[PDB]
Amino acid sequence: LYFPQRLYTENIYVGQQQGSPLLQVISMREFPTERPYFFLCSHRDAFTSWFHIDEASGVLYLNKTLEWSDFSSLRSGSVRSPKDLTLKVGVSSTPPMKVMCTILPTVEVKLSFINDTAPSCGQVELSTLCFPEKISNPHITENREPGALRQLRRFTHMSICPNYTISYGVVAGSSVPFAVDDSTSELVVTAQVDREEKEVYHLDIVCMVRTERNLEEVFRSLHVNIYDEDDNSPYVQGTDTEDVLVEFDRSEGTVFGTLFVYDRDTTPVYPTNQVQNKLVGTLMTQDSWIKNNFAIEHKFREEKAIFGNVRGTVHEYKLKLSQNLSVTEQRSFLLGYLVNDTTFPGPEGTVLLHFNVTVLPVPIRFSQVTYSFTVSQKATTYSQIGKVCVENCQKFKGIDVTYQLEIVDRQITAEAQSCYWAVSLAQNPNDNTGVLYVNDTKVLRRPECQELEYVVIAQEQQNKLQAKTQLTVSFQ
Amino acid sequence: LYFPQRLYTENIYVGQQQGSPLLQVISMREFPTERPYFFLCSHRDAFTSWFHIDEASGVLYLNKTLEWSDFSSLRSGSVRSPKDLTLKVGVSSTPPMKVMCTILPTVEVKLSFINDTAPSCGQVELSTLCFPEKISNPHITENREPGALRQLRRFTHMSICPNYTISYGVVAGSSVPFAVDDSTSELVVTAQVDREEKEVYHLDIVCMVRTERNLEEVFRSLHVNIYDEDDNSPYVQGTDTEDVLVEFDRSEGTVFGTLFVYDRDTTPVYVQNKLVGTLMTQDSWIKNNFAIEHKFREEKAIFGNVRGTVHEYKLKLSQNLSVTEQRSFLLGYLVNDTTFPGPEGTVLLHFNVTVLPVPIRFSQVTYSFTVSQKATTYSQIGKVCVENCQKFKGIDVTYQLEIVDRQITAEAQSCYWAVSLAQNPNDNTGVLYVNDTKVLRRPECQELEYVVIAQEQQNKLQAKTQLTVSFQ
Ligand SMILES: *[C@@H]1O[C@H](CO[C@@H]2O[C@@H](C)[C@@H](O)[C@@H](O)[C@@H]2O)[C@@H](O[C@@H]2O[C@H](CO)[C@@H](O[C@@H]3O[C@H](CO[C@H]4O[C@H](CO)[C@@H](O)[C@H](O)[C@@H]4O)[C@@H](O)[C@H](O[C@H]4O[C@H](CO[C@H]5O[C@H](CO)[C@@H](O)[C@H](O)[C@@H]5O)[C@@H](O)[C@H](O)[C@@H]4O)[C@@H]3O)[C@H](O)[C@H]2NC(C)=O)[C@H](O)[C@H]1NC(C)=O
Ligand SMILES: *[C@@H]1O[C@H](CO[C@@H]2O[C@@H](C)[C@@H](O)[C@@H](O)[C@@H]2O)[C@@H](O[C@@H]2O[C@H](CO)[C@@H](O[C@@H]3O[C@H](CO)[C@@H](O)[C@H](O[C@H]4O[C@H](CO)[C@@H](O)[C@H](O)[C@@H]4O)[C@@H]3O)[C@H](O)[C@H]2NC(C)=O)[C@H](O)[C@H]1NC(C)=O
Ligand SMILES: *[C@@H]1O[C@H](CO[C@@H]2O[C@@H](C)[C@@H](O)[C@@H](O)[C@@H]2O)[C@@H](O[C@@H]2O[C@H](CO)[C@@H](O[C@@H]3O[C@H](CO[C@H]4O[C@H](CO)[C@@H](O)[C@H](O)[C@@H]4O)[C@@H](O)[C@H](O)[C@@H]3O)[C@H](O)[C@H]2NC(C)=O)[C@H](O)[C@H]1NC(C)=O
Ligand SMILES: *[C@@H]1O[C@H](CO[C@@H]2O[C@@H](C)[C@@H](O)[C@@H](O)[C@@H]2O)[C@@H](O[C@@H]2O[C@H](CO)[C@@H](O[C@@H]3O[C@H](CO)[C@@H](O)[C@H](O)[C@@H]3O)[C@H](O)[C@H]2NC(C)=O)[C@H](O)[C@H]1NC(C)=O
Ligand SMILES: *[C@@H]1O[C@H](CO[C@@H]2O[C@@H](C)[C@@H](O)[C@@H](O)[C@@H]2O)[C@@H](O[C@@H]2O[C@H](CO)[C@@H](O)[C@H](O)[C@H]2NC(C)=O)[C@H](O)[C@H]1NC(C)=O
Ligand SMILES: *[C@@H]1O[C@H](CO[C@@H]2O[C@@H](C)[C@@H](O)[C@@H](O)[C@@H]2O)[C@@H](O[C@@H]2O[C@H](CO)[C@@H](O)[C@H](O)[C@H]2NC(C)=O)[C@H](O)[C@H]1NC(C)=O
Ligand SMILES: *[C@@H]1O[C@H](CO)[C@@H](O[C@@H]2O[C@H](CO)[C@@H](O)[C@H](O)[C@H]2NC(C)=O)[C@H](O)[C@H]1NC(C)=O
Ligand SMILES: *[C@@H]1O[C@H](CO)[C@@H](O[C@@H]2O[C@H](CO)[C@@H](O)[C@H](O)[C@H]2NC(C)=O)[C@H](O)[C@H]1NC(C)=O
Ligand SMILES: *[C@@H]1O[C@H](CO)[C@@H](O[C@@H]2O[C@H](CO)[C@@H](O)[C@H](O)[C@H]2NC(C)=O)[C@H](O)[C@H]1NC(C)=O
Ligand SMILES: *[C@@H]1O[C@H](CO)[C@@H](O)[C@H](O)[C@H]1NC(C)=O
Ligand SMILES: *[C@@H]1O[C@H](CO)[C@@H](O)[C@H](O)[C@H]1NC(C)=O
Ligand SMILES: *[C@@H]1O[C@H](CO)[C@@H](O)[C@H](O)[C@H]1NC(C)=O
Ligand SMILES: [Ca+2]
Ligand SMILES: [Ca+2]
Ligand SMILES: [Ca+2]
Ligand SMILES: [Ca+2]
Ligand SMILES: [Ca+2]
Ligand SMILES: [Ca+2]
Questions:
Q1: 3-class SS at A475?
Q2: Which of A267, A354, A438, A455 pairs with B418 at a CA distance of 20 to 30 A?
Q3: Does residue A468 sit in the same domain as residue A381?
């Protein structure tokens, strides 16, 4: 059972008689043998015993003839007319119990108690007799059993105008799965519908009234919203496999591959707790190295243009690094990822995704070309002289290399050790590059201090791998 | 003219005699008829008058027979020994003049004056007869003259073993453009070289020593570096045109495409081989909204055996484009290799830009949420989102809830305290949450109806849809 309508409304008047019908609450069956049992739930309120709902038909009736004192005694806190009354109506597929009112779905019946006697039939405009002032739009879910949807007669007004005949119809320009049941005056849905074909049905209702004058007609435009269920399995467009190379970029959080999965069903905006149409993924590997270093990132968003202008869901799966992978690691594996549409009925609601991963090692090493820098200008403290970099260091990401200058010859006099102050080195972690700059220019005034031979030492941090190269600086 | 090596070193000994050769400074020609003129530059030092260099040959000679007194009087009182002597040698393309010592490049000659006589023949290994102690790895410039690179013979030790005859040769793993001149014992480079083909050569020098009953040989490993010149023009790999679509991401700083420009030459940051670009437009609108992002790196991997330069060009936004913008233009960008001789040092890049407006509208005509009566304060109810709002960048959209029924009593108004809305600028959504649970005890407060209004900041474009919240 579900309710195609969350709120009912009507006016009630002083002098309205015991036993007169007010409105009909509708429950739609989710299965053909399901039978509704209606009951009132507002037993917390005193006014609820002014009313009676028929357990089988769902028609709500006055249980008491309304009086002036009934109006004035409503403790709402607003002394003004009209006083709104809110009733709760419950429905169940078994015989009703008191506790269902606290625990089952209910409908709100909002009544406006007007502190006056009912209007005379000559005082009601045909449009009001025919159709509520503001018509709320019903909703049904796709793939459901046809059934009555809305009682079209205004019960209260046909008692004001008892000598009028009133019939309703669906005006069908195109063929629509909606009609009126002439015998009950209900709008009914005549077939199962498909949210993926149409999410909103526009309807024009015609009311035909035989007056003392002629047969009159009034038209009312409304529409029915179609709710979605998970009735489409996810699928890939093109490949289910993404080739991933891990080499010079090994930094955590970087994305190395992206696979897209599509689902024609809708999903609440990401991220959500709803379980309808949720896709849950699972790494298809028992392997500690893979699990502790790699991870899949899942996101989804609504799209419609790619689905033929029908709202569905686009999923993105991205292979991510958990932590900076050591430059010595080298592995090639085919990583499966099972994507399961959990609420898709039957065992065809999954897609297997594949990440074909190549992880190459990254050597730590200078080219065999040693550096020689010539400073043809008079040295100025802090002027950059040159840069040092291991092979392909400028492509590195997630690899920390630190550079150091050291003196080539060891058995060197104390005085000769000072010529090497002329140049120093700074880390440019922007690239993992080394920047040579001038330091002490005072030592350059010595002709022996104008040709410097250094060793540059690079050190990868995670594994402590070292590379060396030679470096000469000529102050000219 | 250029020096293949910037520092020479040798030993000199007590008892070494006037006129004995010590070593040979090398200058490498950059034109076929260019010739070097060598000269000593050392001014104030007393030991400079001890030496002489042949202006034509570059051979440094002793101009004085070294006595014990010469050593102890050199910087008297210093306890160092040996005592290092630094000489400066200059070269010129025309007849040397005094002023040239101040304004033309020089190499340093560092002589170690040993306070002893030379070793006897029986004391030295053959390698000290053949080679200098310090290994020096020379350099040569690509696209220059072949010629003598290094004197291999060790002049100071010639007489240490008078009956030994000494000659030299080169061996490598591959064929190499290097050889020994039999007549001068010079290592020669026999061809012009191309840095782009080979950046360093690894040679083994062989010294053949003919003793009184044997032909012996000792080896020395050497490396010759090739200095890079800007002799390659930049080029594009594949297409010189990038199609760029500006839609949902329109924030300042966003990069839209990558054009790759390659240059085989190296690029020292500290003007050689520098590529400078120019925006090919006068359009005020374009310039005020777009710039070209240029980054570059040096790389051996993409070029193979020899380091080259990779440049990346990307069209970047200078500010958030209004969602109402819509225009298509073709934007040229000229990249110039400013030190490449001739007019072929430039490449024209193109950006083919389509900028599309972004509509501000709901694609869902109704949001319906169902929440527990026992729901706790601040628990998330759901999210709303204008069409494609999760792709938005540089677009400011806010969301607001409005009550539908305006003719509402004060008591019914308090029902709408149960729900509030928070902005989620991260993904451009609004977040509904539970606010006041106390009003949920009232049956009239359990079905709420709102209008959701989204408003784009710049243009005040609005979108509106229905939202219902049901407390069950
Ligand atoms: C809901 O609707 C109620 C009924 O609607 C009215 O009657 C319908 C039949 C119809 O014609 C409709 O159009 C009418 O609006 C309405 O109740 C009405 O209230 C008024 C105002 O009080 C009242 O008129 C006064 O009646 C006094 C006493 O009358 C006696 O008889 C009536 C009914 O027969 C009873 O309700 C009364 O309780 C009495 O039994 C008269 O004395 C009065 O005349 C003079 O004095 C009053 C001063 O009274 C005011 O102060 C007292 C004390 O504080 C209050 O208790 C009282 O309510 C007044 O506010 C002065 O106002 C006069 O101008 C005059 O100076 C006057 O005639 C109607 O009789 C009464 N009708 C009915 C049927 O009871 C109610 O107000 C509506 N409520 C809302 C929220 O909309
Ligand atoms: C969120 O909920 C709070 C109330 O819940 C309390 O705060 C939560 C954050 C949470 O901690 C709960 O656990 C906690 O109980 C709402 O706050 C109330 O807001 C209303 C309206 O602003 C206030 O009522 C007004 O009070 C005014 C004087 O203070 C008075 O002038 C007003 O009357 C005027 O306006 C009304 C219509 O607005 C009109 O009908 C009148 O005739 C007159 O013109 C009105 O009485 C309450 O005092 C506030 N309560 C508290 C405790 O601060 C908050 O609004 C809500 N946020 C939402 C829904 O966005
Ligand atoms: C430069 O070097 C000389 C050293 O000359 C020699 O050659 C070098 C390579 C080394 O092998 C030295 O050991 C040699 O001496 C220095 O002059 C010498 O210094 C030493 C140490 O101070 C002196 O040794 C002294 O010798 C005294 C006696 O020596 C004389 O008399 C003996 C008689 O047996 C005779 O055999 C000898 O030849 C000397 O004529 C000895 O009593 C004393 O204890 C001390 O050991 C040596 O005498 C010095 N000169 C000579 C000619 O021997 C210089 O000082 C050094 N210069 C600098 C600036 O450091
Ligand atoms: C500059 O770019 C436009 C637009 O290109 C479109 O948007 C970009 C962001 C890129 O992603 C492009 O891939 C994309 O198409 C170019 O005009 C466009 O040309 C294409 C053809 O290449 C048109 O597509 C269709 O092609 C089929 C052929 O199968 C035809 O039958 C269709 O009639 C249609 O031509 C596309 O419609 C067209 N777009 C517009 C707005 O005209 C443009 O050529 C390019 N200029 C360059 C590269 O110099
Ligand atoms: C998984 O990938 C390997 C290697 O793929 C290479 O590296 C990727 C990062 C990507 O750039 C691919 O295009 C590369 O080819 C595949 O093995 C290679 O397959 C190609 C096919 O033409 C072949 O030319 C190579 O020789 C192969 N290399 C090796 C080392 O075998 C492999 O087939 C992929 N596996 C699956 C199941 O897709
Ligand atoms: C850098 O040089 C200093 C000496 O020069 C000072 O620093 C320069 C960068 C510049 O600011 C000058 O004007 C300064 O006078 C070296 O400092 C010496 O370090 C050694 C050993 O660490 C120590 O024995 C000396 O006493 C220090 N002398 C002074 C004056 O500080 C420093 O080592 C150099 N750092 C390098 C080369 O990395
Ligand atoms: C996909 O998810 C569904 C949802 O739970 C799984 O369906 C259950 O599978 C278990 C066995 O693993 C059965 O005992 C249940 O009866 C199944 N239905 C349920 C729980 O509603 C399904 O197995 C998953 N498919 C996979 C992992 O391939
Ligand atoms: C993984 O690599 C990144 C980038 O190379 C490292 O990031 C730096 O980490 C140090 C560690 O103290 C910080 O001081 C720096 O501020 C970080 N800089 C940047 C740009 O990220 C990171 O530390 C490495 N390891 C981990 C576990 O993050
Ligand atoms: C590419 O860059 C070169 C080098 O800057 C430009 O050549 C110079 O242009 C100026 C401007 O007229 C002249 O005065 C110089 O004589 C030119 N040569 C040098 C060495 O500066 C050249 O114009 C640029 N090419 C383009 C197409 O803009
Ligand atoms: C109608 O009201 C009377 C009270 O006068 C009560 O006894 C009876 O049970 C009520 N009927 C219904 C259906 O609520
Ligand atoms: C309806 O018609 C009957 C019979 O003609 C008449 O008795 C009754 O009063 C009429 N009712 C109205 C509201 O006109
Ligand atoms: C070299 O050989 C000759 C014999 O031909 C011999 O007389 C001489 O002493 C040897 N040594 C030197 C240093 O000449
Ligand atoms: Ca469907
Ligand atoms: Ca569906
Ligand atoms: Ca689905
Ligand atoms: Ca070249
Ligand atoms: Ca070059
Ligand atoms: Ca170049």
A1: strand
A2: A267
A3: yes
- DSSP-derived letter for residue A126 is H
Characterize B223-237 residue by residue with b for buried, 16 or more Cβ atoms within 10 angstroms of its Cβ, and e for exposed.
bbbbbbbbbbbbebe
| Residue A297 β-bridge partners | A318
Q: From residue B87, how far is each of A438, B15, B81, B90 by CA, in Å?
A: 24, 20, 18, 10
Resolution for this experimental structure (Å): 2.2
- Cα separation values, A387 from A139, A390, B140, B264, B398, Å: 70, 10, 21, 19, 49
Q: What CA–CA distance (Å, rounded) separates A241 from A357?
A: 10
Query: How long, in residues, is chain A?
Result: 476
Single out the residue of B363, B362, B453 nearest to residue B400, CA to CA. B453
B421 vs chain A: nearest CA distance in angstroms?
15
CB neighbours of residue A103 within 10 Å? 10
Nearest CB to A392; choose among B300, B365, B442 = B300
Of A91, A118, A145, the residue at which a domain comes to its end is A118
| Cross-chain residue pair B268–A139, CB shorter than 8 Å | no
Longest Cα pair distance anywhere in chain A, in angstroms? 128
Alpha carbon distance A162, A120 (integer Å): 11
> What's the gap in Å between A346 CA and the centre of ligand 7?
9
Alpha helices in A19-73 (DSSP H): 68-72
> A130 and A222: one domain?
yes
Is the separation of the CB atoms in B443 and B471 below 8 Å? no
Q: Which of B373, B364, B390, B375 is nearest to B433 (CA)?
A: B375
CA dist B163 and A305 (Å) reads 95
**Together in a domain, A200 and A274:** no
| Distance, CA of A355 to chain centre | 25
User: What are the contacts of A203-206 at 24+ separation with CB within 8 A?
Assistant: A203/A170, A203/A171, A203/A176, A203/A178, A204/A170, A204/A171, A205/A131, A205/A152, A205/A168, A205/A169, A205/A170, A205/A171, A205/A180, A206/A168, A206/A169, A206/A170, A206/A171
A317 in a domain, yes or no?
yes
Single out the residue in A118, A151, A178 at which a domain terminates.
A118
Tally of domains in chain A: 4
Domain ranges, residue A149: 120-227
- In what helix (H) or strand (E) does residue B128 lie, and over which residues does it extend? helix B126-130
The reply to whether A54 falls in a domain is: yes
B184 Cα distance to chain centroid: 41
| 8 A C-beta contact, residue B34 and residue B60 | no
Nearest to B411 among A78, A303, A385 (CB): A78
What is d(CA A316, CA B101) in angstroms, rounded to the nearest whole number? 70
Q: How many residues does chain B have?
A: 472
Strand order in the sheet with B51-53: B21-24, B59-62, B51-53
Residues of B in Cβ contact (< 8 Å) with A392: 299-301
Residues B38, B23 share a domain: yes
Residue A375 included in any domain: yes
Quick check: is A203 in a domain? yes
For residues A223 and A217, give the distance between their C-alpha atoms in angstroms, rounded to a whole number: 20
